[PDB]
Amino acid sequence: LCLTLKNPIRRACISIVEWKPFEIIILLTIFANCVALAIYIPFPEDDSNATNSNLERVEYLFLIIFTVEAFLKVIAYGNGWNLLDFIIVVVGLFSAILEQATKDVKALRAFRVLRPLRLVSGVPSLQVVLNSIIKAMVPLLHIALLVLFVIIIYAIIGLELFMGKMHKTCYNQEGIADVPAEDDPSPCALETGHGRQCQNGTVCKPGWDGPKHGITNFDNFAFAMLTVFQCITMEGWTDVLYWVNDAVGRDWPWIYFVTLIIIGSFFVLNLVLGVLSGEFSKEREKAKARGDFQKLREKQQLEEDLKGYLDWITQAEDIDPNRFCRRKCRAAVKSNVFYWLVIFLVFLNTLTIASEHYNQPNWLTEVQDTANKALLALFTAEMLLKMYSLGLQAYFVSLFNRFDCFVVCGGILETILVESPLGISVLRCVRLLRIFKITRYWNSLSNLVASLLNSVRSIASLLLLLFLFIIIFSLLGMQLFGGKFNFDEMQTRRSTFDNFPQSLLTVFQILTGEDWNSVMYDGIMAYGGPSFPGMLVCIYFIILFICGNYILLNVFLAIAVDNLADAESRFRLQCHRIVNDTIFTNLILFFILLSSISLAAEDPVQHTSFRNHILGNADYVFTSIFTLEIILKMTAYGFNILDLLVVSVSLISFGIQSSNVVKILRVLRVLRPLRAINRAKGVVQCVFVAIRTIGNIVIVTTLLQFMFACIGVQLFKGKLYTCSDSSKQTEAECKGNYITYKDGEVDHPIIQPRSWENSKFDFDNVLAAMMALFTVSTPIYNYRVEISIFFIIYIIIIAFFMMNIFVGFVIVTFQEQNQRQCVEYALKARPLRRYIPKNQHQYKVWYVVNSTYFEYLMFVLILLNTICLAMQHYGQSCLFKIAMNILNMLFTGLFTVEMILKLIAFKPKGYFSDPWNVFDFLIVIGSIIDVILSETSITFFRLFRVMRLVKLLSRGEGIRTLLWTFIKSFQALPYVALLIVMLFFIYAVIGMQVFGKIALNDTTEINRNNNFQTFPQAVLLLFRCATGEAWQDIMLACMPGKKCAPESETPCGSSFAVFYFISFYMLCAFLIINLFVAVIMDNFDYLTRDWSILGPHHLDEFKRIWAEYDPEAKGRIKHLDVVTLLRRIQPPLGFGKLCPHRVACKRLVSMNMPLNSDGTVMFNATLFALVRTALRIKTEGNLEQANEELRAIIKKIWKRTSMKLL
Ligand SMILES: COCC(CCO[C@H]1CC[C@@]2(C)C(=CC[C@H]3[C@@H]4C[C@@H]5O[C@]6(CC[C@@H](C)CO6)[C@@H](C)[C@@H]5[C@@]4(C)CC[C@@H]32)C1)COC
């Protein structure tokens, strides 16, 4: 609200003078402070260098410039973004002057990290990106109102069952001390609770603050909400589960987590993608509206024009003939002789480069040098000759040719240099150009590189914003937690806000979630213990994992949806009788249905306890059953390739007579039902096509990992070798023994032996680098920091194109996959009634129960109950528990009132005729039974209460619709769901049979809580791997050499492991992306709709208004509609304030009405007429055009007695 106090002059006319010069110096000051907050090293205690104090000095210049600017601009006016300036200044000068005499800014001076926001504010280049980002999150606020609901429901349920049970721990050795359990202490359970039982001479006893310093316990509510949150982010969900499993037994803890994950992450994860993608498409559409794609095609056609007449200017000297040389080189460049030859020289040169390996003899070193020397001469002559034939200009024009020239110059440079080793290696890394000069598989290579340039160029500004955000947080990190990480442990923390470099690293790790929850603890245990004010440090490590990851996802998607696409665009008779009748069909479906359970249910540990034992006979019998499947065999043999798999499984089943591997090779039975579902008809080739696409994509990554690492060899060879004794720095020096003090105990000398060892990720040869590169997918700073960044790029590049080729590849799936729908909701739609009270008493209550207020009150009471179950700590004064129980009684009683009232405002059937009403009924009865039991399992009848909260979700249209929609599409994902369960099942039986008897050792990863001995536990282990939870280690635990279990009676743990787990991870990821894509695509109408124009949801309102003015199940409205016709019409539909008594009536009578009586016209007439006015318009004569159009097209000519219009 501009004051417009235009007091003549000298108000403004100061910053008005030299706008651009004065604006810039402020921006330069901002950039100087962004580089001033990144020096001050934050320190232990109060020590300071000269610079720090000297930067506090220049903060007294940045706090005289920002104040004169502020006041001079105030004089002008005295809005939004400028508020940031004002608050930063206020807090600033303040803080200082306050502290001026004080000589604990921290917080008070941890605000200046908000100054780099003025970098966004001033520069308008990314300010638009910030509005786009902000304006894209507006739709997905319903999803932020639901992630919160799931968390709350889960936290509440959780504190109720598992709170306070995690406090024991094997606490001794029948002597006197502390948790002995190695280190890892894990809730233990007394000899009566079926939890872990403690062994040896250990004893369980109360104490142990917690599972993990007390911050991973459902004790108390806040710890509970936070635990659930850390838990849904799939960052150690298995661990919380194991601690809980240890404390309360293993039977029911798991259901609660599997759900939390499936309903919390997979389901919730999809919505954000669906909401975000729909938004991108809207933007993509606006962009298409621009016509840019067509313009880009015209630019490429211009490019081929300059080439196609570049050959013409080349020929221009043919009539001007020196000339001979020109003609020769022209033929050459065209002559394949040059092409194939040069391609060959590439690979061979490529070879030379890879040849380099540590400890290389001259046999190699000599050869490499000799080759390069000549190979380099080769490329030169060729490029040089290609210069003349081609048009110098156009030759330099083609990006690739230009890069070629650049790198040949690199060779010249390195040669004249030889006339540091690192620099030479770098130049040779540059020479990997030719390596890809051949443009192998350019079909993709070219597109990916071209796209890569386009893609990277496209998201420049978004990347800028990401970087600004990261820098801001890192500065806050060093200010907030910097210096507070001295926990007095020689333990080396990779994550520490000691300095900005590390600060950035910590932030990135948190963003990547490598150990982000762990980093939380550092701060939340730094500033203070796991107490009250010591947790307001966590409110930070989240704001970074949601916001950062949000921006990160926004930036990615863009790559995809917004580029890839733009870029990519007698006896036999009777036999049939029986074998066609249900019996020899739906019945057989059963004979395998439960037969499949045979492999699913088996004892794969103990030898032949009846259990395992007898199960052989059933196999035998199902197999005689498959012989019977021979009576059906020649019935009509030579959809039967399925029948050959029946033949094979049947034969190996009879082959079970005396055989092992074959036995375990019987899981094909499960797949005998999968065919039946695709047989629900509705492609095999498409599947094959998808598989081919996937394989192809594997190869791109593979070759990249090759070239990237051939870079590593040249750069890191021989710089990881080291000795155990840090003092020694030469292989020769490292010979003998040294002394190590356990945990830095001066009184704990340990005579270890010195050894010269190469570190992990040994780039000693292309090969090891190769596998390490896989290892990242599957010292501290000696030279590590550098390697670090190398181990971040393979990533970027990898994803960058693994996605590019794939998601863009997919869309064809979408190719395969409003006015009409609105017509069909106007036609083929019937009006509804509403229960009216037939009795006076039945009525008063009705008015009330339906009185809006009553609903208002109900919700208030609901909030209160949950605010009464939330407060349940670990140690609550008994008075308090009594209070809580009495309160629950009051609440249950109040809900009884409503149930009974409603049943007296709506007849029994009416109340019960509504799902929500029945839900309420159930909650109430169960809650009352709980009350009874208490006044007197029990716990189950208690959780109930909490659930009610859900009914608060059956409210806002925004949230109601989204869920309903996706739920209304979580059935059209069958084929990508049966497929997934099939996977789990098969892999599990297989697994339980090979990696099964591996003995269980709590110290390893095949512990009693993640074993492979009962179908259920194996499916849980596979779900962990799928959820990407350290699947790796489980895998290592399944390699040969593990001892066989005692009941099994080291011949165990077959090597197949790698194939299994890796194959599993891969297949799972795919099937899952297929799931998400399937869902969203199928529901891609809601995910993108111009709510402005008319849709169905904008149309149902008419029924709820019409029935409001309509007694029974009726139609045939009275003429007194003259009021309601526009009484309450959504302005998108009709008018909103315009005089109702306008032509509105004359026009509604203007079109002909159906030849009915005075009051025998349906609601369909008014509805469809309003829709028509709301949609495409037509004139007279077109009356019949419209009529025939309706009864020829919209659901074809669905016969309708639509007499006259509408
Ligand atoms: C009705 O049909 C309309 C259809 C609309 C076109 O749909 C586009 C919308 C984006 C969409 C659905 C498309 C392709 C792959 C989809 C992606 C797979 C990736 O998977 C993820 C999962 C999570 C990430 C870790 C990796 O990538 C998502 C980010 C990514 C994803 C789900 C984002 C959405 C993408 C194309 C056109 O029809 C011809």
Ligand SMILES: COc1cc(Br)c(C[N+]2(CCOCC[C@@H]3CC[C@@H]4C[C@H]3C4(C)C)CCOCC2)cc1OC
């Ligand atoms: C109703 O008819 C149907 C229509 C469609 Br579309 C589908 C879905 N399908 C299956 C989706 O994935 C099939 C491709 C493969 C299935 C196995 C995994 C992941 C991927 C496969 C590559 C490894 C049918 C096959 O091609 C199109 C996609 C199933 C139907 O049921 C037969």
Ligand SMILES: [Ca+2]
């Ligand atoms: Ca992880």
